[PDB]
Each structure stands twice: as C-alpha cells, then as structure tokens.
Amino acid sequence: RSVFSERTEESSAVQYFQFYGYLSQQQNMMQDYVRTGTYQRAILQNHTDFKDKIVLDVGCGSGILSFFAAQAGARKIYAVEASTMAQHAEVLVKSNNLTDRIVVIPGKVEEVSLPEQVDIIISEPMGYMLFNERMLESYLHAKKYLKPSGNMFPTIGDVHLAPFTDEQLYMEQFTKANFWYQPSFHGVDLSALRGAAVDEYFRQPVVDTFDIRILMAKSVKYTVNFLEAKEGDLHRIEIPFKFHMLHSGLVHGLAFWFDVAFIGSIMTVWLSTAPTEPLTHWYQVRCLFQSPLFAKAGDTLSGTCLLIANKRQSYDISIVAQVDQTGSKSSNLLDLKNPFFRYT
C-alpha cells in the first residue's frame, strides 16, 4: 500500500491511467497552445531556476515539460509518469538525444524511488475546477524529494468563483430532467422519478465557456500555495464567500475558473483559465442551483463552497448560498467527477 492506493480505489485508478495512456489525449493537451506555450515561457524566462539544477517532473506524460527544463539547462530531470505514456516519453528522450539528462521513471510518484533530492518540481497537476483528479496531492506529496530551498512550478494556484446568471443554461438542464415528469411515456407514468432526475442533472457541474457579462459580482479568490501546503490540506477545502451583488437578477449558480503562477527567480508568469482570456482545454466550470436565488444590486450573497475529496480521484462539492437581505437559501451537492461537457 502507498499514499496513492489508499486514497484511490482501484477501479478509479485503472480508468484514470488508461485515459492518459493514449497519445490522442497527449495531442489534445499539447495542442492547447496557451497551456503549452505558457509553461515553456515560464520555464525559459526563469532558466536560472533550472540551469544545472536537478528537476522532478510529476506526471510528465509525453515528457514535454522535461524537454523545456532541459532546454533551460537542467543538469538532470527525473520524469515520473504512471500511465503507459511513460514508454512513449522514453522514445522521445532517445530520439531527441537527451538520454544523458532526462530519466523517465514509470510508476506513481507516491510509489517510485527517486535517486536524489531535487531543486525544483515541475508538473501540470491542474484539473478542471483545479481540484479534479486529486493530482495536486501527488504534487504536494512529491515535495518529500524537494530540497529545503527548492521551488515548485507552478508555485500557487488561485481558484476564483463568482455568482452568475444564465437562464438559457438553467432551463436547458431543467427541461432535460422534466422528461421524467411525463405521466404516460408509452403509457408509463414516470413522474415519481422527477425529483431523482432533477437531483442527478444538477449534481453535474457544467463545463464550457461563458461571456463575463453574466457574472453578477466580483470573483472571490481562494489560494493554495504549493510551497507551504501539505497533502492532507486538500482532503477538505472550505471556501467561505460573501459576494456584493453588482446587478439585480436571478443567481443561477457559481462559476469557477483558476489561475496558476510560476514564481521564478527572474519573473513571475501566470497561466489563467479566466473567461476573459483565450480558451484552454480546461474551459470554466459552473455549478447550477436547483432553484436560483433572486438578488438585488447591492445585496450580499454569502455562503460556503465545501470540497470533500473522495476515492474516485475527484471531489464531492457542497455549495450553500444565501441572499442575506431576504434569507433565501440554496443548498446543493455536486459530483465533480461527473460533469456535463456543454461546449460546442
């Protein structure tokens, strides 16, 4: 048993690493130009955090981040990957004549044995809504190989949330569940499952992009600092919020996106998935309320977004939201692992 195998039931890890074993999925990530170009910029601009340093690449995939670190002058790079993609990273190491510098090490970073401590860790541990996959814990877990003065790339992750209004999205999901409202579907009365259908459809976060004009309040920010956080910190994530409404209207839920910052010795570079920035394969994430809350420009929408980690390498999301001026409350349970991908 290892830290990984405990917090992960096998059936989730199988399907999980099966997915990353396919080159088509590496092509999709790597073709995300904002994602891949921003990592490279961050690493080369801060080449002195790599020049002749020892590097750890957590979940290197095809190894692209290890090649950037080599391009920055790294002395040695242990590239760890637990999917079958590790064999393909080896092939690229050989064909790019970097076998003297990049050392692919297959397995889960919670289980492999590195030969020495590293100066800097690099990785892309961010899921949609930042916390899906629970890979940040693997990232923080890897700090056991990190030197006292060592650095983390990315160094911090800022998750943002803001109330939104989107009647088109609410009715779309709402009418889908209303299928189970029918009293005589082929003569069969389905109405008794109406409540179960609605709970299921609204248990799903919606993954797609949205114009910022639908946001009704400034975003609230919750920062996870990867240099100071430890694994267990991310088992239960409590995000208190208190939004000052800037527009009247129906609050249909909370929209989520995230930024990460590579805090190097030369400059800080940001990778942002905000709706104001070019689109990335992470999109944004919206959690709908089963019943929207009405707020007036100037009210305060307060509550708590609670994220409880589960054995499926994801999180059970709890969002309780309350319009203080009227006591209108909304309680919601969402399953980050079962999103609805709406983008077209």
């Binding site: 399907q15 999980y16 997915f19 990353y20 999925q25 999709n28 990530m29 073709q31 995300d32 899921g127 949609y128 899906n132 996959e133 993954v207 689109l279 990335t280 394969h281 992470w282 999109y283 499926r312 390498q313 994801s314 980050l336 692992k337 079962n338 999103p339 991908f341 983008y343």
Partner: peptide, 10 residues
C-alpha cells in the same frame, strides 16, 4: 472521472 481532460478544438 471518465475524461479528466476535455477535448479542445484546434
């Protein structure tokens, strides 16, 4: 989940 990273059009 089923697809941790979403398809991004190029």
């Amino acid at each position: 989940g089923k697809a941790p990273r979403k398809q991004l059009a190029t």
